Amino acid sequence: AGIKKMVAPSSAVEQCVVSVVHGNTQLNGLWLNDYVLCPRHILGKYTGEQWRDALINANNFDFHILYKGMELQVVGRELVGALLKLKVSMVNANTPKYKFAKARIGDNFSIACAYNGHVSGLYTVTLRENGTLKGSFMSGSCGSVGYNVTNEGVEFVYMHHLELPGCVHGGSDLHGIFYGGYVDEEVLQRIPPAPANSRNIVAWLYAAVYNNCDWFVKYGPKQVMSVEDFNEWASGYGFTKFEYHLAFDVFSAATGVSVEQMLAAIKELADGWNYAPVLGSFHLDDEYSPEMIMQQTS
Amino acid sequence: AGIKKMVAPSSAVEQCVVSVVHGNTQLNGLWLNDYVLCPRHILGKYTGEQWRDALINANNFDFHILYKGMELQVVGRELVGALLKLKVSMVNANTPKYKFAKARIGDNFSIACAYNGHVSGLYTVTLRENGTLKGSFMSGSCGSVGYNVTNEGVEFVYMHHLELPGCVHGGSDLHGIFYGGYVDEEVLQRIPPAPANSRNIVAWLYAAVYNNCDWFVKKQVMSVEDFNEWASGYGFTKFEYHLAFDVFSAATGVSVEQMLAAIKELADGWNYAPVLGSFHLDDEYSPEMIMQQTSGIVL
Ligand SMILES: *[C@H](O)[C@H](C[C@@H]1CCNC1=O)NC(=O)[C@H](CC(C)C)NC(=O)OCc1ccccc1
Ligand SMILES: *[C@H](O)[C@H](C[C@@H]1CCNC1=O)NC(=O)[C@H](CC(C)C)NC(=O)OCc1ccccc1
């Protein structure tokens, strides 16, 4: 029992994290095969077609790359979306089996938070409705990657670029595509809102029942709210339309609590509560994917 | 900016995690040098003096150990407090620089939660006043270790043994000493409740101020002496100094006494506005975990 934010083990990622320094810009890259990927603002702060011109005019010898104190010489440079791809003269002999994948809204993945080309800390994030994260990043952490680990190998899903006002973090996939409607420029940007993820909240409320925290359904006469009714309510109250997940078949069977009881709970609990904590909290938590809860309950 | 539960990188620990199976009992161990440590209940469910005799009567060949699917033959065995130390036929050539150290109350450390000798996920815990953790463990996860990564190398501080009432967890240090007043026996054990850690709450409120959330200090400061008297009757620990607070107070312009007054105001919860997303004081962040996440904040 117990419910925690589960990070994936980082050994395969650590063997790929490098520093990349150009001028006064210090950030991190990802070394796979014979190349390093890093955010294109390693070049400086540009917009639009200025990135291509900054690429043409840069010199490979001006990019200083280290892996654990060993220099990697840059022998080619190219832009890949919002990333620079720097070919280097040495193959990473510890390149893991890997794929590049896109995170889906509501998914968790793990951040290998790095400074000076060394991973300093790992943590879980959740991809929000507007393609942002609530992470923990300071100057020097750009190029930190987000990843998952499966039976097949590592999946790299994210590389960090920027912090929007309100501590809203933004980045790209490893093909250099930004995850939401923001760009890597220090100008004000209007971005769609981030409604609470109802699906994830249902997973967390099941987690609570698994852990004998069930006052919000076991006390008071049973209530249910239909999906249709819940969706119409949710659209006016800053929650996402409900989406089903196969985990809920397992959870509902094991707990005896239906999905419709959980939707009615969300509506009742949506302004918070003070009766008793739910998994330590007095507000609904949308940060856990159904996968993360299943891995800790069954 | 932002505040998250920060786990230490796991590469060094992963190269030490093994499965240990004895009969129907499946758990994990820690392979360092030419030995593996694992919980003694790999032997069965014994009590008190029976463990010594159960270890003496076991055969080395009845312990099956795998590292990443590779067999490690047990060639010796010894009881070390709550652990078995199983000598094996191969030295771990990836043994990191390490020490065994005791976590202190309020400390964070990272858990490498393992099943079948494979780390499935990591998370952070906080050593509570009564020597328990709020972790996440299922059957098969015993022998998972807690660790920190420091300048010197890895510090192994915890090995997992059991789940107590209330979804709380207990275990030992790597000398086999249990962290609180409990043992590895499946009988009801009464353990003293754990007050909220005031020191860590102070660190978390500083974290909020670093992140431009400071409504709760915006006078009436409270002295450490008055705070300690109030805390002793309200389920909070006495304040304890931590040298991170010299940095936090200077950077934020907010004194510890302001923060202690805030703890008293906020002790029953609030609903004015969130603090770092929360409506109750959070004691799960050590001052070291906050410092690591704020040291580069300019604003
Ligand atoms: C890269 O290391 C850094 C990460 C930031 C630093 C603070 N917290 C982060 O996540 N990224 C930047 O500094 C980034 C560089 C630009 C050229 C994209 N700029 C930034 O994040 O400034 C904050 C900001 C971004 C967009 C509009 C208004 C303010
Ligand atoms: C060892 O893997 C296991 C870890 C427990 C399993 C459930 N959650 C844990 O943390 N330890 C035990 O099973 C332990 C064995 C004794 C001989 C020490 N007994 C125990 O923890 O009893 C409580 C319990 C609660 C829920 C399921 C199984 C056991």
Author numbering:
A (entry chain B): 1 to 298
B (entry chain A): 1 to 218, 222 to 302
List sentences quoted exactly from the publication behind this structure.
While the spike protein shows extreme diversity and quick adaptation to thwart antibody responses and vaccine effectiveness, the 3C-like main protease (Mpro) has remained relatively conserved. SARS-CoV-2 Mpro also shares the same overall fold and active site with 3C and 3C-like proteases from various coronavirus species and even other viral families. In this work, we report the crystal structures of Mpro from the gamma-CoV SW1 in both apo and inhibitor-bound form, as well as the crystal structure of the delta-CoV HKU15 Mpro in complex with PF-00835231. All four structures were solved with the dimer in the asymmetric unit.
The bisulfite prodrug GC376 converted to the aldehyde form (GC373) and attached covalently to the catalytic Cys142; both active sites were fully occupied by the covalent inhibitor. As previously seen in other Mpro cocrystal structures, the attachment of the aldehyde warhead can result in either (S) or (R)-configuration of the hemithioacetal to orient the hydroxyl group. The electron density was best fit with a 50/50 occupancy of (S)- and (R) configurations at both active sites (in the figures, only the (S) configuration is displayed for clarity). The inhibitor GC376 was bound with the glutamine mimic g-lactam at the P1 position, making direct interactions with Glu163 and inter-ligand stacking with the P3 benzyl ring in one of the protomers. At the active site of the other protomer, the P3 group was flipped such that the benzyl ring interacted with the protease instead of making inter-ligand interactions. The leucine side chain at the P2 position was tucked in the hydrophobic S2 subsite, consistent with the substrate amino acid preference at this position. The P2 group interacts mostly with Glu186, located in the 180s loop. In protomer A, where the P3 moiety bound in the same conformation as in SARS-CoV-2 Mpro, interactions with L162 were less extensive compared to the equivalent M165 while the leucine group of GC376 had considerably higher contacts with Glu186 of SW1 Mpro, compared to Gln189 at the equivalent location in SARS-CoV-2. These interactions were even more pronounced in protomer B where the P3 ring flipped to orient closer to Glu186.
